[PDB]
Symmetry: C7
Subunit: 302 residues, 7 copies
């Protein structure tokens, strides 16, 4: 179609569809994850090989606990120890054990900016008068300003969906986390340090905290993004092509969840009147992999 | 399409077993809710299994009463408790019995949220001259400044499975003054989320000091459009899904918890006060491809 | 992962029926309209029928009290105008459960800091001055939209029996919204939602004109609300009701105690009618038979 | 409707009223669905109607040939379809009326030292800050029935050379309405025919004319045989006038308008002739 | 309902697209036409849609050039203003109706203060407490059944990034002046043509569409198709005391016409 | 109202050639449609391909050396581009062508000494790359000038072929002034890719025209001209006034590279003229 | 109908992919042959897909993190240019339509009076002020493709077609805009800086702005979707295209160079240091319309 040619023609799908859509779904309840996949085989005899479109769907939960509960520790210990396992990285892999992973979705696109360069200049003039013991003034101003502005459609932290290293064998994605505006103040990230508060991305009372248990001094789950409390739903699409000479293959479909443990403690300097929040990188990881046979003669999948 | 493929090929619906649309509707009047469902069976011979799409519509009423008319009977602590049951969460769950089949693709989900952080910087210069009387007397001025300006500008999915899928319809904020949330704290007012009149209007009962001017949903109701999909083997015959409908509610009251000078009425609201549940099961016949 | 027009019912179906019935209620100058279409999918369990309500209902906004206009208190401004506020339209299935069902429509930080520097001079003095400023701002703003004129097709409670809609009124910018946010207040003006002149003369011509206000408020809204009823092949008849209502308020002005006042629903009139949904021959409250 | 019904009997009938240079147009297509109960017919009104904006002053009457100059600027354009109160029932009319679709607070702090009266400071400040058809041709659906349907495309106000905003109702402080004024005090004693903003210096429609696209539909039983619909077209006019001598002071020009001065209507009926649907007056 | 159907297109017979193009080189104008005759049996009459395309040049000269002459230099430029297009059917034949495109409508705080000041021994502290409270419009003159007209006026343009000047903006007019300060030939003190709007230096490309219907009994018709160009003569003078450059223009100076007739045969739906 | 109903044919032809002197690539896409319902036969011509800018600084190559006359850097940056289509003054007809606030105040102050108050009461563009114009067409010669207007160099702007300054001249392609690296200005120009996508790479024409001739008529030798035009901005610390003020000025049409090839339209003989005979 | 390819029998889409693991590049290509009998020649559309990784190392990361002698000598090899070329052998030729293309970059370029009175007591009266000002603001803005992905089409031919997806600039920690030539008097280039001043002791390998704190492309890989088409006469028999894939790289480095300062980290960068290329030829058979 890029050469004033008919659309949906250069595109495979003319007198050859057979549309052999298959589905297989599975759950790993230990980390309460739900895999989904959607394959459709297209075998056009005009081509040399048989094409198969793979669509992964479903969702994968954050499953956000607070696993270290030391409420205040008034007298013996220098203070509380409350942690929260906030997930950060969500790597998804499809490792072919055959034939190449031809297409990969989504990809990288443009980022939208609006940089502004403003200049303004002014003039002034005034008069003041008096009669009885009092002095008059005068004024005649002149001003000139230059303003520069920036603005980008950054998707808060949400979870940015980058396309990490591909292969015709191993496809990967690393949908990371960036930062959030806790209680309308922001934007704070995983790096932002304060001399007397630490990281406040997960702080609840943003002015001065009453001396309460840190198990209930966290900003609530739903006071944070929709994904961070619920889970992301993949829509990643991949395609596999194999020759009519070639036959059955054995795919792997891995889904992972990196997790971070943002912690609140007075034990990490001060924290008595205020309350300090801290973050230690890459704490929890869990993996669940699964293999699948791609039949190519009857164009099923088990 | 995104795979340089022809449009509408990867998706099923070709020489497939019709669009067996079924329908079932009922009303639970106690909380006056009206459930609706519309299933469509697709039996693709090219596929290995049989597809069925479940679409949930209809409507759920809020039925928001004012159950505490204290200011009207005995004025306890001048101008007392008027309560309002503002519902907050609306969980809808579909829990298939843990022996039969698997749940599959579900709509809606959570989505990326986009923000726009701005960084503006401006710098200027100044200059002026003054005149006076009493023979001879000018002044002068020469300014220089620089500014930096920064500007900026919920349907949650609680744990799902191939067996139990659930959603959490949260609440975000309200305004003509600034945003206030389900937790917004005032040192001398508490939560003022639905406050109308500050400092008392006429020492009136709080039955008529509430802001009426608020969203369409509360009172009227939102209509769900949630979609789910189930696929089952061609050999197997039946299944027993559950469909739970819930309404968690909060009870914001306007009472003299605190009162100062001109009756500065105080408002407080506490989460998840009232709950109501309404479940019903449905038979997933797979050989005759219906559902009651 | 589904195709287009595949989850939708509409395959190898049977005669789409598409009947019509229109009538006028002239007392309140009302025009009722209905759009029924029966669709009988053999693949389904039951028979589907889509009802589309159309036509219109006029506001016909008068000023019905123009006489106190001479002298002595309560005089040349005791002018009332019956401005309607709420427009509920109801479809109450005969309490017997013909299974109502699906329905349409439905319901749904800045910071700036600066720095300064200056010098002050004179003519024959002894010393100059200097200045070094520092500023920092924090700005928070909001803005709402959607249905400002508030003709919002809210969906008040539906059932398997009675479906309803409430297109109410919130507020508008009369003249130039110099005041009145919406059924609001003023300590010396009252409600200014319907004020033309703040100082001004007969009060019949000191009102902001009918056409100086939104298109609907002077003319009337046309419903397009559609509902669908599905019933078993066992059933052969149905009995919906179709109510049309017009709640109205009587906004009145005053010279002084220029005071204006909004008054909650005072006078209303309704026009409802039921319809027979014959399912074995697809007739309505009209026409006859055949064979 | 209109599914596997065929017919699609598009007819056309046009006439011109040259006195006010109006051009009526109609576009009917009859659809007879056997699945339906009755016979459907959609009528589409098109064509145009001119504004014909004159300045008909200083006309055979002439010390003041440059005084009291009027312009008959139209305001309302009502289009009506009045079936006689004994026929087949009017139904759906297009278009309809639709819904038409900020608060900021900022607080700051200050503090300064003036060195190198003024030798100290400490500030605190707080601020609170709060799709118009400017070419006002609002297309309202004014009172109708299943017998007489009407429309009121009225006019509201304009942005005179981006300077305003003035309406036909709101009046300049001590000038009346200046919406069609070009120069307020520069031409001190000039002829009043030429102190207006040109016809083209204001919206596109105001000097030329609107083309209707109003569509209506009539349905009648298959038992019934004939109908006698009427379709009226009207043209209201306003009288904005310019004169000098207001309160003197550099020739303040008086701008005034006494509303609803001239009116014109152009109606004609048509026989639908269901028998053959000829929809062109006449008879059977 | 049947409201958005109005289906003439359906089973439209003969699809008789015709084409004819011509040029009038004197004013470098190019007329184009696209006719299609449709004889729909469902209709009463036979319909024919005419689509006008092509282009028309501005051809902007400066034909009065006295280079350096209180009395100015008198260099004028004939910048055209109005572009009238007329279609004059003889006042006895069938009807004309419908016109595309059409005209459209146009879519268009309280604060507080506070401060405190400190100073030295006999000076005194201060305070503060503030409070505050705050063009190528395409017009469609009336259609008729025979004689249709178009005018499509223009008002003004914004000279290089500054201000706005119209066909009535009174330096005098600087609409076509480049530098006002102060003295070459006045033929070359104008802002360059490509530094001015795209239309002013090129031309307009008509896209006007019209439709004609005629009764099945009657035969042939004799339409006119006029193309016109009203022109204005903007004039430049370099002082007409400081030496500033003054610009003047008077409306409706030059007009030129190029008309052509066409036979509407109706029994075979050919247009020559 | 559009030709394409029971019209068959669909005889898409193509002819491509390269002009290596300016490294230009002309492309053509003709499709003949002979609708029997019409009177004449329709043929749609679509010109595609691209033409490189090839923007040099003709004062280049390693310098160091022993130069007396300062630096003297020039750049031949093209401005206008044209795609004329001139059918021979005796052929068929060309029928259609594409593209075508107030406030108030009040305040109070308090002080020391007898009677010490004080009061206050206040009361108050498709720039940056080119333009796609259509100079007047005819039924014989259709021709357009895709010229260039202005750019915002290094976040400062906007500057244009007319942009003036009292002490720098035109700075449209300036990187930095006053003392810029005070080296050769060959590496003091704003980089070519710091400028529009077109200016450093080349524009791809997409102009569409259509030719129709009567079923009676024969032959229509057309001609497809392709041209370019460059501006010559000069910048040097050898014609200026020393004291920094490194000024630079720009002039008009200086370089041109026209390319032509009268493809015999063959309004019935298809095979557009190509390598004439065997190659 | 203006578009060719309708009922165009041959749609013989083939695919051929390979990976070069040393610099971890993976080439992919997608051709479909269409043989239109109405035309004179046979058309073949090639779609380049797959991806190419940045694989961004810090290869000079301070060996043992030595403070005064090694000091601040951590570099980062950030690639800049990504040229993709298709060079037909000089006997076949006949390149035609190429996607994507270039386009116009879009830009958007864009008085008061006073009066007041002051009053006091003591031998004194009122004061006055009457201001008058006027300002003229001038702004501009485009939709910057700032991060990277400026997708230019350098000169095409019937022999060699090329693309230069360059890199332009970035907003380092939301401040900008900074480019490869952005100089500061005391810091050099800050395009790749994390911390504007560290108190003397951090490793400079972990003093970089994090990888994901930089554009999506910069840390992962660009995925081409670039399409080209080759047409050849029915007389001709075969052709030999080249498909080169390249990655020019820059070495952004913090190096003593000019000794050191008061703990402030200087950043510098020199262009186009290391590059890697991966080319391969392919036979475009035209009789059986395959391609190895």
């Amino acid at each position: 179609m890029a050469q004033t040619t008919s659309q949906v023609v250069t595109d495979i799908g003319q007198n050859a569809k057979t549309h052999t859509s298959y589905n297989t779904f599975n759950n790993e309840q230990a980390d309460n994850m739900t895999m989904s996949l959607k394959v459709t085989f297209i075998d056009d005899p005009s081509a040399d090989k048989q094409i198969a479109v793979i669509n992964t769907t479903g969702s994968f939960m954050k499953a956000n606990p607070t696993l270290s509960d030391a409420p205040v520790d008034g007298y013996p210990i220098p203070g509380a120890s409350v942690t929260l396992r906030y997930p950060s990285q969500y790597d998804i892999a499809m490792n072919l054990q055959t034939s190449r992973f031809f297409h990969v979705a989504p990809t990288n696109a443009v980022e939208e900016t609006t940089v502004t360069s403003s200049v303004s200049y002014q003039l002034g003039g005034s008069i003041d008068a008096s009669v009885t013991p009092s002095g008059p003034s005068g004024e005649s101003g002149a001003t000139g300003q230059v303003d520069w502005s920036d603005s980008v459609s950054y998707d808060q932290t949400s979870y940015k969906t980058n396309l990490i290293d591909q292969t015709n064998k191993h496809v990967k994605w690393n949908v990371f986390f960036n930062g959030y505006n806790n209680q309308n103040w922001g934007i704070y990230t995983r790096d932002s340090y304060h001399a007397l508060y630490g990281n406040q991305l997960f702080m609840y009372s943003r002015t001065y905290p009453h001396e309460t248990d840190a198990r209930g001094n966290l900003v609530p789950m739903n006071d944070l993004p929709t994904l961070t409390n619920s889970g992301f739903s993949p829509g990643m699409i991949a395609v596999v092509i194999s020759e009519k000479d070639t036959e059955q293959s054995s795919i792997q479909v891995a889904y992972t969840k990196h997790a971070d443990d943002y912690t609140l403690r007075p034990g990490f300097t001060f924290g008595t009147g205020n309350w300090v929040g801290n973050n230690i990188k890459d704490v929890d990881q869990k993996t669940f992999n699964k293999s699948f046979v791609l039949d190519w003669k009857n164009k099923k999948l088990v």
